[PDB]
C-alpha cells in the first residue's frame, strides 16, 4: 500500500495549520493521575 | 416480499448438503444413497449473479429434487401407516429371517417413529423451504482524483489476487492429491499416485502443459473420486449389502472397503487403538472433502484473469544464485542416501554403494544432469513396491522364501504407512527437481 | 409490504408468546427419556417453549 | 411553480453550508451567555459533522464493552486504516465495515 503512505504523508496539499499539544498534555496528566489514585486494582 | 439473489444462491448452495447429507449420515439405506447424487448434482450448479437471471435448468433439478423428496415423504409415510396400523401389537421388536432382510433392503419399538419422522420433518421442511424462496421471493427486485487513485489501489490489490492466490491454490491441490494415497494405499488411490509420478516427470520436462488437457485429467481425476466415494457409501448400507459382500473377503480389502460391524449372516447388534481409527474414519469424510474441493478447484482453474547496471547488490543475489545451481548438482544426492539409510534395503544397499562410488568423478555437475533420469526411474519403482507393501492384504499374497532373504516386508502399521510414504513423496521431491533442471538445461541446448 | 413486514410480523409472534408458554406450564412432561426424540425436540425447546 | 419557487428556497437554506466553518465560530459563541434558541440548533447541526469520530468513538465503546478478540480487528482496523488514510477512507472501508 504504498500509495497510502505517498498520499498521507507527502500529498495531503492542504496542510491544515493546528497545533494540539495541550490537549494531549492534559489526557495524558488525566491518566497518569488513574493510574496513581487508583492503585489497588493494577495490583493482584 | 422479494430477497436479493446473491444470498438466494449462497443459502441454496448452503442448504443443499446440509438437509442431504447429513440426513445421509442420519439414516444410511438405499433412501440415502439417492439423497447424496441428488446433493452431488445439485452441488455442480452454476453461480446466480445480480443482473443474471436464474438458470433453467438449475431450476429442473431443483424440481427433480423436491419431487424426491415429496415422493420419499410420500413412501416411507404410506410405509409408517401401514405398519403402524396392522400389527396394532407386539412391543418386542426381535428381528431375524427373511423378514428383516427385506425391510432392511428398505428402498412398535419407541425410537421406530421417532427416527421416522425426523428425516422426514427435516427433509420437507428444506425442500418446502428453498422450493417456497424460489417461487415466491423473486431474486431480481428490478427487471476526487486522489480518491479514485485510491479506489483503483484496490484494483491493484486485485491484480495481485487473481496472479497469486489461483497459483499458489493450485500447488496446494498437487499436494492435496499427494497427501490421499499417503494415508490409504489401496486400489482407490494407486491411479492417482501413478497418475501424479507421470505428471511429476512430465514436469521434469519443463515444457508447460496445452491449456486445455489438465482440464481432461483433473476431470478424469474428480469422476473416479466421485464414483469411488459412492462405491464406499454403497458399502456402508443395511443387511442386503453385508449379506452380499461380506466381511472379510480379499474383494473389499484391494478396494478400500472397511467394517463396520460384527455383521455374519446377520449376527445383528449395532451399526457403529487410535492409531488406525486415523485412516479408517478419516478416509470416508475426507475424500468426500477432496470430491468437493476438486470440483470447486475444476471451476476455479477454469476462471483466472482476463489477459488470457553496478549494482553490487546485484551482484550477490545472482552470484549466490549461481552457487545454488552448484549446490542443486550435489543436494539431491544428499537426499536419497539419507533416504537410502532411514529404509535399509539390499536396495539400500544399492543406492549406496552405487552413489558413494559415482561421487569420484573428476568431470561433475554435466555427468549428474546427464544421468538423472534412469536414477527417477529406480527410485520411482521402490514407491511402488512400497504401496505393494502397504495393502492389507499382508499375508494373503504371500512372502516366498526369497522375500524372506531380502529382508523387505510388508508394513503391519497403517500408520507407520502414512508416516513412511508422507517422508517419501517430501524427499523424493528433489529428484523430480534435479529432472526438471536436466530437462531445461537440454531444452536451453537445442 | 411495511405492514406485513413490520407490523404482520410483530404481531404474528406475539401472538404465541402466550400460547407457548401456557404449553410450557400445561401436563407437566412431554419430553425427557433415553434415547432419540427429544434430544432434537430439545434443540427446538432450546428456543420455543 | 411551486416546485421552482421551493427549490430555490431550499436551496438557498442549504447554501448556509458553512457547518465545516462554524463547527469553530459557534463554538466561540456558545461559550459566553447565549441561551437563546439557536444554541440548540447550533449543536444539533454540529454532532451530525463530525460522525466519523462519533463511529470510531462507539467503536472504541463496542470493544471495551466485552474485551475479546473477535471484535479486536474492528477497532485496530478502523484506527489503522480511518485515522491515518485520508479525510475519507475512499467509501469502500466503511463498506468493510458494514
Same mark, same amino acid.
Given at each position: 500500500?504504498?500509495?497510502?503512505?505517498?498520499?498521507?504523508?507527502?500529498?495531503?496539499?492542504?496542510?491544515?495549520?493546528?497545533?494540539?499539544?495541550?490537549?494531549?498534555?492534559?489526557?495524558?496528566?488525566?491518566?497518569?493521575?488513574?493510574?496513581?489514585?487508583?492503585?489497588?486494582?493494577?495490583?493482584? | 416480499?422479494?430477497?436479493?439473489?446473491?444470498?438466494?444462491?449462497?443459502?441454496?448452495?448452503?442448504?443443499?448438503?446440509?438437509?442431504?447429507?447429513?440426513? /445421509?449420515?442420519?439414516?444410511?439405506?438405499?433412501?440415502?444413497?439417492?439423497?447424496?447424487?441428488?446433493?452431488?448434482?445439485?452441488?455442480?450448479?452454476?453461480?446466480?449473479?445480480?443482473?443474471?437471471?436464474?438458470?433453467?435448468?438449475?431450476?429442473?433439478?431443483?424440481?427433480?429434487?423436491?419431487?424426491?423428496?415429496?415422493?420419499?415423504?410420500?413412501?416411507?409415510?404410506?410405509?409408517?401407516?401401514?405398519?403402524?396400523?396392522?400389527?396394532?401389537?407386539?412391543?418386542?421388536?426381535?428381528?431375524?429371517?427373511?423378514?428383516?432382510?427385506?425391510?432392511?433392503?428398505?428402498?412398535?419399538?419407541?425410537?421406530?417413529?421417532?427416527?421416522?419422522?425426523?428425516?422426514?420433518?427435516?427433509?420437507?421442511?428444506?425442500?418446502?423451504?428453498?422450493?417456497?424462496?424460489?417461487?415466491?421471493?423473486?431474486?431480481?427486485?428490478?427487471?476526487?482524483?486522489?480518491?479514485?487513485?485510491?479506489?483503483?489501489?484496490?484494483?491493484?490489490?486485485?491484480? /495481485?489476487?487473481?496472479?497469486?492466490?489461483?497459483?499458489?491454490?493450485?500447488?496446494?491441490?498437487?499436494?492435496?492429491?499427494?497427501?490421499?494415497?499417503?494415508?490409504?494405499?489401496?486400489?482407490?488411490?494407486?491411479?492417482?499416485?501413478?497418475?501424479?509420478?507421470?505428471?511429476?516427470?512430465?514436469?521434469?520436462?519443463?515444457? &508447460?502443459?496445452?491449456?486445455?488437457?489438465?482440464?481432461?485429467?483433473?476431470?478424469?481425476?474428480?469422476?473416479?473420486?466421485?464414483?469411488?466415494?459412492?462405491?464406499?457409501?454403497?458399502?456402508?448400507?443395511?443387511?442386503?449389502?453385508?449379506?452380499?459382500? &461380506?466381511?472379510?473377503?480379499?474383494?473389499?480389502?484391494?478396494?478400500?472397503?472397511?467394517?463396520?460391524?460384527?455383521?455374519?449372516?446377520?449376527?445383528?447388534?449395532?451399526?457403529?487403538?487410535?492409531?488406525?481409527?486415523?485412516?479408517?474414519?478419516?478416509?470416508?469424510?475426507?475424500?468426500?472433502?477432496?470430491?468437493?474441493?476438486?470440483?470447486?478447484?475444476?471451476?476455479?482453474?477454469?476462471?483466472?484473469?482476463?489477459?488470457?547496471?553496478?549494482?553490487?547488490?546485484?551482484?550477490?543475489?545472482? /552470484?549466490?544464485?549461481?552457487?545454488?545451481?552448484?549446490?542443486?548438482?550435489?543436494?539431491?544426492?544428499?537426499?536419497?542416501?539419507?533416504?537410502?539409510?532411514?529404509?535399509?534395503?539390499?536396495?539400500?544397499?544399492?543406492?549406496?554403494?552405487?552413489?558413494?562410488?559415482?561421487?569420484?568423478?573428476?568431470?561433475?555437475?554435466?555427468?549428474?544432469?546427464?544421468? /538423472?533420469?534412469?536414477?527417477?526411474?529406480?527410485?520411482?519403482?521402490?514407491?511402488?513396491?512400497?504401496?505393494?507393501?502397504?495393502?492389507?492384504?499382508?499375508?494373503?499374497?504371500?512372502?516366498?522364501?526369497?522375500?524372506?532373504?531380502?529382508?523387505?516386508?510388508?508394513?503391519?502399521?497403517?500408520?507407520?504407512?502414512?508416516?513412511?510414504?508422507?517422508?517419501?513423496?517430501?524427499?523424493?521431491?528433489?529428484?523430480?527437481?534435479?529432472?526438471?533442471?536436466?530437462?531445461?538445461?537440454?531444452?536451453?541446448?537445442? | 409490504?411495511?405492514?406485513?413486514?413490520?407490523?404482520?410480523?410483530?404481531?404474528?409472534?406475539?401472538?404465541?408468546?402466550?400460547?407457548?408458554?401456557?404449553?410450557?406450564?400445561?401436563?407437566?412432561?412431554?419430553?425427557?427419556?433415553?434415547?432419540?426424540?427429544?434430544?432434537?425436540?430439545?434443540?427446538?425447546?432450546?428456543?420455543?417453549? | 411553480?411551486?416546485?421552482?419557487?421551493?427549490?430555490?428556497?431550499?436551496?438557498?437554506?442549504?447554501?448556509?453550508?458553512?457547518?465545516?466553518?462554524?463547527?469553530?465560530?459557534?463554538?466561540?459563541?456558545?461559550?459566553?451567555?447565549?441561551?437563546?434558541?439557536?444554541?440548540?440548533?447550533?449543536? #444539533?447541526?454540529?454532532?451530525?459533522?463530525?460522525?466519523?469520530?462519533?463511529?470510531?468513538?462507539?467503536?472504541?465503546?463496542?470493544? #471495551?464493552?466485552?474485551?475479546?478478540?473477535?471484535?479486536?480487528?474492528?477497532?485496530?482496523?478502523?484506527?489503522?486504516?480511518?485515522?491515518?488514510?485520508?479525510?475519507?477512507?475512499?467509501?469502500?472501508?466503511?463498506?468493510?465495515?458494514?
Amino acid at each position: 500500500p504504498i500509495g497510502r503512505f505517498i498520499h498521507q504523508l507527502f500529498h495531503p496539499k492542504f496542510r491544515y495549520i493546528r497545533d494540539l499539544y495541550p490537549i494531549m498534555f492534559g489526557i495524558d496528566v488525566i491518566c497518569f493521575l488513574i493510574m496513581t489514585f487508583g492503585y489497588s486494582a493494577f495490583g493482584e | 416480499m422479494t430477497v436479493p439473489p446473491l444470498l438466494k444462491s449462497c443459502v441454496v448452495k448452503l442448504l443443499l448438503p446440509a438437509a442431504l447429507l447429513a440426513a /445421509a449420515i442420519i439414516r444410511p439405506s438405499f433412501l440415502s444413497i439417492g439423497y447424496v447424487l441428488l446433493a452431488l448434482v445439485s452441488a455442480v450448479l452454476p453461480p446466480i449473479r445480480k443482473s443474471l437471471a436464474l438458470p433453467k435448468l438449475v431450476g429442473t433439478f431443483v424440481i427433480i429434487t423436491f419431487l424426491f423428496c415429496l415422493a420419499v415423504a410420500l413412501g416411507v409415510g404410506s410405509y409408517q401407516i401401514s405398519e403402524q396400523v396392522v400389527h396394532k401389537n407386539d412391543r418386542t421388536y426381535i428381528c431375524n429371517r427373511s423378514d428383516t432382510t427385506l425391510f432392511r433392503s428398505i428402498g412398535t419399538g419407541t425410537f421406530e417413529s421417532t427416527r421416522a419422522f425426523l428425516p422426514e420433518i427435516i427433509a420437507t421442511s428444506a425442500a418446502l423451504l428453498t422450493i417456497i424462496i424460489v417461487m415466491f421471493l423473486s431474486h431480481r427486485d428490478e427487471q476526487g482524483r486522489e480518491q479514485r487513485r485510491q479506489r483503483k489501489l484496490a484494483a491493484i490489490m486485485w491484480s /495481485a489476487i487473481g496472479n497469486s492466490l489461483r497459483r499458489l491454490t493450485n500447488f496446494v491441490l498437487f499436494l492435496f492429491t499427494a497427501y490421499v494415497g499417503i494415508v490409504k494405499p489401496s486400489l482407490s488411490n494407486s491411479i492417482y499416485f501413478l497418475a501424479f509420478l507421470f505428471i511429476s516427470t512430465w514436469w521434469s520436462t519443463y515444457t &508447460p502443459l496445452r491449456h486445455g488437457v489438465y482440464n481432461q485429467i483433473k476431470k478424469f481425476l474428480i469422476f473416479y473420486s466421485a464414483l469411488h466415494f459412492l462405491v464406499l457409501y454403497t458399502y456402508q448400507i443395511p443387511i442386503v449389502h453385508h449379506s452380499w459382500l &461380506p466381511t472379510g473377503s480379499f474383494l473389499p480389502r484391494l478396494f478400500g472397503l472397511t467394517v463396520l460391524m460384527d455383521s455374519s449372516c446377520p449376527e445383528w447388534w449395532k451399526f457403529p487403538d487410535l492409531i488406525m481409527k486415523w485412516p479408517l474414519y478419516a478416509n470416508p469424510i475426507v475424500v468426500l472433502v477432496f470430491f468437493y474441493l476438486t470440483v470447486a478447484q475444476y471451476k476455479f482453474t477454469r476462471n483466472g484473469s482476463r489477459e488470457y547496471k553496478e549494482s553490487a547488490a546485484s551482484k550477490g543475489m545472482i /552470484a549466490v544464485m549461481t552457487f545454488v545451481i552448484f549446490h542443486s548438482y550435489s543436494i539431491a544426492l544428499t537426499a536419497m542416501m539419507t533416504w537410502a539409510l532411514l529404509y535399509h534395503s539390499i536396495f539400500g544397499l544399492i543406492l549406496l554403494i552405487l552413489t558413494c562410488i559415482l561421487w569420484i568423478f573428476r568431470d561433475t555437475r554435466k555427468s549428474s544432469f546427464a544421468m /538423472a533420469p534412469i536414477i527417477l526411474m529406480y527410485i520411482e519403482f521402490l514407491l511402488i513396491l512400497q504401496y505393494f507393501l502397504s495393502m492389507d492384504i499382508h499375508a494373503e499374497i504371500g512372502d516366498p522364501a526369497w522375500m524372506n532373504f531380502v529382508g523387505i516386508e510388508w508394513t503391519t502399521l497403517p500408520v507407520h504407512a502414512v508416516i513412511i510414504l508422507c517422508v517419501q513423496t517430501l524427499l523424493t521431491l528433489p529428484v523430480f527437481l534435479l529432472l526438471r533442471l536436466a530437462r531445461r538445461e537440454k531444452f536451453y541446448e537445442s | 409490504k411495511r405492514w406485513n413486514a413490520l407490523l404482520g410480523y410483530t404481531l404474528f409472534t406475539i401472538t404465541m408468546k402466550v400460547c407457548l408458554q401456557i404449553f410450557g406450564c400445561v401436563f407437566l412432561s412431554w419430553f425427557d427419556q433415553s434415547g432419540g426424540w427429544g434430544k432434537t425436540l430439545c434443540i427446538v425447546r432450546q428456543l420455543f417453549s | 411553480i411551486r416546485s421552482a419557487v421551493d427549490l430555490p428556497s431550499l436551496q438557498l437554506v442549504q447554501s448556509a453550508n458553512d457547518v465545516e466553518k462554524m463547527e469553530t465560530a459557534v463554538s466561540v459563541d456558545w461559550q459566553q451567555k447565549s441561551s437563546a434558541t439557536r444554541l440548540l440548533n447550533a449543536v #444539533v447541526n454540529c454532532i451530525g459533522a463530525h460522525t466519523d469520530i462519533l463511529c470510531y468513538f462507539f467503536a472504541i465503546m463496542t470493544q #471495551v464493552m466485552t474485551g475479546g478478540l473477535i471484535t479486536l480487528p474492528l477497532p485496530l482496523m478502523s484506527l489503522f486504516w480511518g485515522n491515518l488514510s485520508n479525510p475519507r477512507p475512499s467509501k469502500f472501508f466503511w463498506v468493510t465495515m458494514i
